[PDB]
């Protein structure tokens, strides 16, 4: 690929 | 003829090849793409500028080397352009005077792709530079190679367009929050651009993309693209219609989205490609 995106998250409860 | 880098740090001259550390800094421009402007990385001068003048060609077969190995282009030299790899000869660059004067070389390659890239890392191998170094008064005549190395990480663009980042990492907010994502392209000229997404996907629709967290990962869950409120699958192309020479946003949103069952608390990571195409 042209671009390499990191998507980071977090469920809580 | 004597010569030394930006930093000051001495090149030896002549007999054996010399392996020369340059900042580059890689650019789409039109027709073709700068890999590096040698004009401000090394400089040179003549020791005896009351009685010799020195003279100083490119000669035929200097090329890229190492991962460009495989491009062709173009050089500036000294102030007009030639094919590279060089196929003849150059005109001279003259020096006569104690005071530093650039090297007048550029060096560029022929677009071949869209918005790709190739990555240099500091240390690798870039060009492999003849020079022949004559004067005005005996027969003196000698030849000798310059390894142009990369003294910083870059990527060489590969085509017409350029992009805001090679690598952009964004941070959701709090499930179920959504987060845009910062990327744009522009172009040397104008261009007709889509894009599309690569990746492993978790979903009948082919738009929710895994979750590969590493540590306590959350279920359920992966990360899901949009751009103005529409979804985009994976291996779907997006039109970006055309776009200049300033920059347009891919107009990406980054948000989760459900993959079945029960949502469980955790955390949340998906690498995600994007890819351009000519329309």
């Known amino acids: 690929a042209d671009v390499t995106i990191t998507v980071n998250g977090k469920v809580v409860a | ?16 090849s ?17 890999v590096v402007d040698l004009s401000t990385q090394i400089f040179c001068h003549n020791d005896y500028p009351e009685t010799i003048t020195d003279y100083v060609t490119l000669q ?13 282009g173009t050089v500036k030299y000294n102030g007009s352009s030639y094919p590279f790899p060089t196929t003849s000869e150059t005109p001279r660059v003259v020096y006569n005077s104690r005071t530093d004067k650039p090297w007048p070389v550029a060096l560029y390659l022929t677009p071949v792709s869209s918005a790709g890239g190739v990555a240099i890392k500091a240390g ?23 390894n142009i190395y990369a003294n910083n990480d870059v990527v060489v663009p ?12 964004v941070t959701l907010p709090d499930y179920p929050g ?56 994976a291996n779907n192309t997006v039109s970006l219609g055309a776009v200049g020479t300033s920059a347009v946003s891919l107009g990406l949103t980054a ?14 990571q998906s690498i995600i490609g994007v890819t351009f195409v000519y329309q």
């Open chain 2, 18 to 34: 010399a392996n020369v550390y340059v900042n580059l800094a890689p650019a789409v421009n039109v027709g073709q793409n700068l």
């Open chain 2, 178 to 233: 959504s987060v845009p994502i910062p990327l744009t392209v522009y172009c040397a000229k104008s261009q007709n651009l889509g894009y599309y997404l690569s990746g492993t996907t978790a979903d009948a629709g082919n738009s929710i993309f895994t979750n590969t967290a590493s540590f306590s990962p959350a279920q359920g869950v992966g990360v899901q693209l949009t751009r103005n409120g529409t979804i985009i699958p």
């Open chain 2, 255 to 268: 948000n989760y989205a459900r993959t079945g069952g029960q949502v469980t608390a955790g955390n949340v």
């Open chain 2, 60 to 72: 035929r077969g200097s090329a890229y080397g190492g991962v460009l190995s495989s491009f062709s």
């Open chain 2, 158 to 169: 590969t085509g017409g367009c350029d992009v805001s980042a090679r690598d952009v990492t």
């Open chain 2, 124 to 146: 690798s191998l870039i060009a492999v530079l003849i020079l022949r170094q004559t004067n005005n008064y005996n027969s003196d005549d000698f030849q000798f190679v310059w």
């Open chain 2, 1 to 16: 003829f004597a010569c030394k880098t930006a930093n000051g740090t001495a090149i030896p001259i002549g007999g054996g």
